[PDB]
Amino acid sequence: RSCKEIKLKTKTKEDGVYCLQTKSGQFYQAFCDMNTNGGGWTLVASVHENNIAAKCAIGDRWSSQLGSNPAVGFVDGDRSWANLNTFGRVESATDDDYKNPGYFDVDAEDISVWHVPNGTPLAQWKISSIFRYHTATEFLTPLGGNLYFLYKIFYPLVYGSGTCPASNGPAIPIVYDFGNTISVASQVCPACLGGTLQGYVHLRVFNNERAPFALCSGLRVLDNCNTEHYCIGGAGYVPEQTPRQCGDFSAFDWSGIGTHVEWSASKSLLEAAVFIFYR
Amino acid sequence: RSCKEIKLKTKTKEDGVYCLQTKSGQFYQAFCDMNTNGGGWTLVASVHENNIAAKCAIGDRWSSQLGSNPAVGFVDGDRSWANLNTFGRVESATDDDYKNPGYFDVDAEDISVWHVPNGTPLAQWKISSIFRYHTATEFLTPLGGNLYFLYKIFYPLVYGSGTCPASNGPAIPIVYDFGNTISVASQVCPACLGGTLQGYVHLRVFNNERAPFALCSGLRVLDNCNTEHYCIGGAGYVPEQTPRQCGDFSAFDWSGIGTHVEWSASKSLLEAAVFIFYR
Amino acid sequence: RSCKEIKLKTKTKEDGVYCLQTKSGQFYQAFCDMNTNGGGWTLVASVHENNIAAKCAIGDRWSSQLGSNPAVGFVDGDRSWANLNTFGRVESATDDDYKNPGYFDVDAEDISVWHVPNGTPLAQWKISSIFRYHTATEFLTPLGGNLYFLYKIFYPLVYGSGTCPASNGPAIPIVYDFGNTISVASQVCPACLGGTLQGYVHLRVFNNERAPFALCSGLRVLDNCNTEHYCIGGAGYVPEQTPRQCGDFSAFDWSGIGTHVEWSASKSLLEAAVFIFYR
Ligand SMILES: [Ca+2]
Ligand SMILES: [Ca+2]
Ligand SMILES: [Ca+2]
Ligand SMILES: [Ca+2]
Ligand SMILES: [Ca+2]
Ligand SMILES: [Ca+2]
């Protein structure tokens, strides 16, 4: 049902694709990592950005595909963070979004996160990745066991029904597998660090506009509610300069693509699919 | 090749996913139901509505995805009712449209229909469903054996090439597996019942505008040609108040979503994926 | 890993679907042809056109899905010719685009091309096809072994970075498996032949506007740079009468659909999915 038990019964197993099945019984294939900290991490999702200029258009499966509309039928986006919809396949996880049943079925304790440059074939994924970390606090069990139930518990990613830090989500300390806080500070915007703290993963942050964002990889949000620039995923509506802040990678191009200025992420991060692993 | 033979050779089998193959030989997995009336029903399709406000937009795979355009290249929609295109996977059949090869390959005698609330995991599908029925007239054999050939025989779902009841499709009497005619009358619009009769499934009805609709689940159409409000699927063009009548669930929101008024379906039906089974 | 070795170890095998795996190990199914010139051709792609009137819209996975935009994030299209993204399934390869891992993994010497009318079930593919040819020059080995590496070598299909014939791609002589140069001259536009020569396949031609097109099936381009009318695929931007020249089948409808006049392809070719095989 996961790569963890595969590592458990069968010790010497290594990285690669394995056959798994949901407990309801449908088969699928998942990329098991078996070397990271005892191994056993199952790849369950990937947040790829095909076009930073396309503001909630085709391919922004994680935020919205029909635009940024505040209508009652639009503010919930695609719910791809909190629904059973699955898409993409394994070896294309670095060229377009990917999500397999293991996202919601497999129960887990910790999540691991990789940043892999787009276009990277499978055999390079671990060595070509620029950032790799994972949590070690077993925080998923009180939250339902996976991110699906984590977004049934606080939060349903709904626009407007919260506020910045007063209503933010959890902030989990991470351990670095590849990369370091200096590199973290080198990949995010310059004005990023003025309101964050490296070394944590943050789930369901609220921006200044009450719009919720799923994930902030690498840093915990401080009292700075300009979170559209360093957190990915989201709902289907953001009102500040709409729709310049829509997409899988919400506003990483505020001041120009990859130019790495006050509000612009480094180019190395604009081309980085964010792999999510369960254990 | 189907779940019927699986039930035949191997008796005691129950609900769940099984491995099947088309006669051309490609493998797939299908959810076999084995308790309904001797069992043996294969799940072959699912008409999910992700956004009732999106009029022939992304996700309306059963009616049209490019809008309601009367141009010569547009009036045929996506033909997903009468083509070999397949999409989605099994356990996501309750969060987005689903269709597997068994739709056109497997020959069958009867169809079964379920209404399952969106977001329902597989293990709940039968018990959480609100409506379940099936035909018992073996009407698919004269029509080619499945719905694909049923839409090669009358009708190619083409706009304009017919009229209401004078050119309507078949009306098959159904037996109720869960639900009853009172509940049926409770789920459809109020002004619905003024022109229909419970207890039948109707295929290829024509609306007042000559636009054809694939399926009317639960009721047979009378001389009332306002069929956009209780029949799903369709072609790529409907001219009355275009495009307020486009989508997988064509006009179930004419007078407000789920408000259950003169032309509005009950909320319980707006969130209901329509599962189709073959036998 | 391909159908070639399946033909090699196991002689008498015939046309049909077989199980293959990438060298990284993920399984898939591919349609192996085993009769063409010793057989062993693996079906790896299919360029289907669902709507000639939709100019770079949903379903034009090979050229662009977000329109014809000259913005820096748009001129590269979807890169589906040169990325690991895969989509569609086998038996639907004649109703919508299709591409499997064998596109980029399998190394090959020659390519075969079929034109199959849309809606054709699998069992008819070979006999219902109108054109079938294949190269016999083993030209893929110097280019990386497949079309993916062929579009890492010249050319990255990028708009503007070339010109017509001075910077065109390779022109490979083909042998005819079904069809002949008279039929070829009968399927393309009338004003087509005034600037081409039958009997070659041409990869990465540049149109008069420096926009690059992936493939010209059946003919080699002469000094005529009006290539938008007989070459398929492309990038995400064409500037002449934008966007009347966008789509999988770029401009085969310049003077009316299927009307077979000066700039219009024959109707038999407008409904023809282009199957690509490796060996
Ligand atoms: Ca994306
Ligand atoms: Ca802000
Ligand atoms: Ca739908
Ligand atoms: Ca009406
Ligand atoms: Ca296409
Ligand atoms: Ca031209």
Coordinates of C-alpha atoms and ligand atoms in Angstrom, one line a residue, chain C residues 46-51 57-63 95-98 247-249, ligand 5:
Chain C
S46 CA -0.4 10.5 -32.7
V47 CA -1.2 14.0 -33.8
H48 CA -5.0 14.2 -33.8
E49 CA -6.9 17.3 -34.6
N50 CA -10.2 17.6 -32.8
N51 CA -11.2 21.0 -34.0
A57 CA -7.3 25.9 -27.8
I58 CA -8.1 22.8 -25.7
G59 CA -7.0 19.7 -27.6
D60 CA -4.2 21.3 -29.6
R61 CA -1.6 19.6 -27.4
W62 CA 1.0 19.5 -30.1
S63 CA 1.1 23.2 -30.9
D95 CA -10.1 10.3 -31.4
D96 CA -7.6 12.5 -29.5
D97 CA -3.9 13.1 -29.3
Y98 CA -1.7 10.3 -27.9
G247 CA -3.3 24.5 -34.0
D248 CA -2.1 20.9 -34.4
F249 CA -3.0 21.1 -38.1
Ligands
CA5 CA -5.2 17.5 -30.9

